[PDB]
């Protein structure tokens, strides 16, 4: 290992001693990758061992199995689990690959060359050789593009993926004719992030998702080649700090943004996160409650269209600020929700009064009731319901877990952008250790600020 006397970094910053040790840095990164794959495999095995296909996935607190099921792999129409074996196969494969990666990390961390510059020039970066850093970026960018095209191939020629918008309760569909139109695909990124627009979180079709991943894979491969064969422009040299900690800070900012995006994706989106596996969203549960009570009071005579609430605004139906007919009550805040079980009841001007009277099918009612009883509300100790409950139900929605956890991770990695980026700037300038004490900048400035 190392010591503080020869490095200047204490034990609580010991990995910082690896900044200029290329081989051991590679070993550490490979070991952490092996850790990631090991958690993937072990947690997948844990979930399948604790899984009963009779109950819905979101009832049993599973996060990885919904991810595998969204890709097909043993789900029938309506999100019914047919074979749990593919989940087991995925767990075993990720686990064994993790064993291999862990051995590799151990080797490259203990016995492998400490610095790769001399013996292995192909792997000998210098943290300031801009061409070499761009080459590494290009290699890993090509790998990412290949992964995106792998997803596209899975959806195209390998059984498709689980479309929750398919007629009926949703089913595994083979996506043909992906949305490869530039305007449609790039209109999401420039779309507003507010209500009704939702930025890229509001992607609703599988065709749009597959076309977008097509564009991203192609662009990532092309950009990998470009960043391989080119050196940053002279204006790029002046704009950025060129050090390992600087690159780390840039990546930290990027992945903090991605973590926030994933949190919002899990909370709001129900296309890439079908409610059959992840359970209803917040808006979905609220709309489901309103719909269930509407159909209950409509079955008991009454006329929900003319039913006036206590505020004089409409007990079951009202008009969105734009004019679209929407469910009344507080759920008017979620009027822009769209779900597989409510779209058939929507006409050109929103919810249709005629369809809401006779076109409702029993499966829609059952799904709405189930979503209402499993709203994404829970406690820290996994007690379902609002904060004022009887501590009888054991349920917290997987969407809530994903949203909370990855939001915390996104915030902490933004703090990482701040910390590691400021330190990169200071170290490049030379202030990393403190004021000069012989030539303070402030003492060279005119008084009174």
């Amino acid at each position: 290992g190392r010591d503080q006397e020869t490095t200047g970094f204490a034990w609580w910053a010991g990995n910082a001693r690896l900044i200029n040790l290329s081989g051991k840095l590679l070993g550490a990164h490979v070991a952490h990758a092996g850790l990631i794959v090991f958690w993937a495999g072990a947690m997948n095995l844990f979930e399948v061992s604790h899984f009963v296909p009779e109950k819905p996935m979101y009832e049993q607190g599973l996060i990885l199995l919904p991810h595998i099921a969204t890709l097909g792999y043993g789900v029938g129409p309506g999100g019914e689990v047919l074979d749990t074996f593919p989940y087991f196969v995925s767990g075993v494969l990720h686990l064994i690959s993790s064993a291999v990666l862990g051995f590799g990390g151990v080797y490259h961390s203990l016995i492998g060359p400490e610095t790769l510059e001399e013996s292995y020039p192909f792997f000998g970066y210098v943290w300031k050789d801009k061409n070499k850093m761009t080459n590494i970026l290009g290699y890993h960018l090509i790998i990412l593009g290949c992964g995106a095209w792998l997803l596209v191939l899975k959806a195209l020629y390998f059984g498709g993926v689980y479309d929750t918008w398919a007629p009926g309760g949703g089913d595994v569909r083979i996506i043909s004719n992906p949305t490869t139109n530039a305007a449609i695909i790039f209109g999401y990124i420039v779309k507003s992030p507010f209500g009704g627009d939702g930025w890229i979180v509001s992607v609703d079709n599988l065709e749009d998702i597959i076309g977008g991943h097509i564009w991203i894979g192609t662009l990532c491969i092309l950009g990998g080649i470009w960043h391989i064969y080119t050196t940053p422009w002279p204006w790029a040299r002046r704009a950025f700090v060129w050090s390992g900690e600087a690159y780390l800070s840039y990546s930290l900012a990027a992945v903090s943004l991605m973590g926030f995006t994933a949190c919002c994706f899990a909370w709001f989106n129900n296309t890439a996160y079908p409610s059959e596996f992840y359970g209803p969203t917040g808006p979905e549960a609220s709309q489901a409650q309103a719909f269930t009570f509407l159909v209950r009071d409509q079955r008991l005579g009454a006329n929900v269209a003319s039913a006036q609430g206590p505020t004089g605004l409409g007990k079951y139906l009202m008009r969105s600020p734009t004019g679209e007919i929407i469910f009344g009550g507080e759920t008017m805040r979620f009027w822009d929700f769209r779900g597989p079980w409510v779209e058939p009841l929507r006409g050109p001007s929103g919810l249709d009064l005629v369809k809401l009277k006779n076109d409702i099918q029993p499966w829609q009612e059952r799904r709405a009731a189930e979503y209402m009883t499993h709203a994404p509300l829970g406690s820290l100790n996994s007690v379902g319901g609002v904060a004022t409950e009887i501590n009888a139900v054991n349920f917290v929605s997987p969407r809530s877990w994903l949203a909370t956890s990855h939001f915390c991770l996104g915030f902490f990695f933004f703090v990482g952008h701040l910390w590691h980026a400021g330190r990169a700037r200071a170290a490049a300038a030379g202030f990393e250790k403190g004021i000069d004490r012989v030539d303070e900048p402030v003492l060279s400035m005119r008084p009174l600020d």
């Binding site: 409409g314 050109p348 001007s349």
Partner: protein
């Protein structure tokens, strides 16, 4: 946008554009309204869309005049989906009736000088009569606030306090109107409809309407103000 043009569009092509609040407009009919075939029709798809709101105000000289206002509640003032009956007579006599549908909309205009005037724009149970050129009638105007509505201090009919509990020494006749006088008595309004165009083959009609109804009485706290609402209406016969 006629009925077919509106119906062809999908929800995603309409959400966010304000088209929903607009009522459909007949486009290929004939202005000669006397050509409609007499008979009894089940009037459905009945919709009403205001074009202006004016509030009656009486000045110092007693000249009760209607003042234009500014709308506050956005595009939530269109009645649609209503069903009813209509009897076209040979001479043009009309027996208009409205039964169901989204026949009420709570709105709030603002009067110059900064007055918030809420009201239920409604045509509930409008039993009209008159000629085919113009038929008038009365309609029910329910209380703007339901009985279970709670005032900012918890007072209200049915569920409520019937007392200003914030003053444990003041519940006397000086506050009779505010306490326990939550009068939810329904009022009446007057409306006049004129048929502008009729499509006989489609069987649809459209025209202009003018209605006068009281404002929100705030559960009997203050007197109602007269609201005049002009607009255009559409409907389908049988």
């Amino acid at each position: 946008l006629t009925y077919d043009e509106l119906q062809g569009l999908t929800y995603l092509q309409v959400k966010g554009t304000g088209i929903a609040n607009t009522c459909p407009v007949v486009e290929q009919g004939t202005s000669n309204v006397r050509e409609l075939k007499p008979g009894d029709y089940k009037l459905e798809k009945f919709c009403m869309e205001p074009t202006s709101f004016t509030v009656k105000e009486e000045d110092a000289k007693g000249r009760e005049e209607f003042v234009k206002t500014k709308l506050l509640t956005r595009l939530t003032y269109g009645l649609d989906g209503m069903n009813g009956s209509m009897k076209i007579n040979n001479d043009g006599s009309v027996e208009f009736r409205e039964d169901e549908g989204l026949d009420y909309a709570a709105t709030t205009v603002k009067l110059p000088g900064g007055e918030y005037v809420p009201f239920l724009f409604t045509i509930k149970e409008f039993d009209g009569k008159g000629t085919l050129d113009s038929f008038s009638g009365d309609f029910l105007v329910p209380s703007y606030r339901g009985s279970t509505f709670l005032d900012p201090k918890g007072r209200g009919g049915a569920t409520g306090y019937d007392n200003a509990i914030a003053l444990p020494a003041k519940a006397d006749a000086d506050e009779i109107q505010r306490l326990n006088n939550k009068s939810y008595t329904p009022g009446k309004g007057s409306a006049v409809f004129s048929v502008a165009k009729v499509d006989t083959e489609t069987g649809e009609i459209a025209g202009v309407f003018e209605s006068i109804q009281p404002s929100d009485t705030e559960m009997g706290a203050h007197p109602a103000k007269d609201i005049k609402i002009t607009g255009l209406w559409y409907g389908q016969l049988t």
